[PDB]
Structures are given as structure tokens and as C-alpha cells.
Amino acid sequence: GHKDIQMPDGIRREEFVQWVELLPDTQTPSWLGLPNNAERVLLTTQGVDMISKMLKMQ
């Protein structure tokens, strides 16, 4: 949505490490610049891959 990542205003490394350690942890592909459906596409591909592996299994 309208929210976006804000770069730290600090000038020392400690502020940067505190900021990254305090990251929201709700990473979405939109962080990378990719569309948010990229995760859905990747999960679909992984599910198809698991289906193929299970089919090869028997």
C-alpha cells in the first residue's frame, strides 16, 4: 500500500544495525521491486515441483 521503507538518518554503523535488526519482518516481494504476485508465482512453481517430485517418487 501507501507505506514505504524509510532510510535511517543516522551516521554511525550502530544506528544502521539497530534499524535492520528492527525491520518489520513482514518481507514481501514488493520490497525487492518485484510485483507482490511474484511470491504467489514462486509458490505455485514450488508446488508444481513438489508434485513432480512426488510423481517421480512412485
- On whether the CB atoms of residues 28 and 34 are closer than 8 A, the answer is no
The residues, ordered by sequence, that sit 6+ positions from 14 with a Cβ below 8 Å of its Cβ are none
**Run of H or E residues at 24:** none
Rounded distance between C-alpha atoms, residue 29 and residue 39, angstroms: 6
Q: Return the CA Rg of the chain.
A: 18
Rounded distance between C-alpha atoms, residue 8 and residue 44, angstroms: 35
The residues, ordered by sequence, that sit 6+ positions from 37 with a Cβ below 8 Å of its Cβ are 29
User: Obtained via which technique?
Assistant: cryo-EM
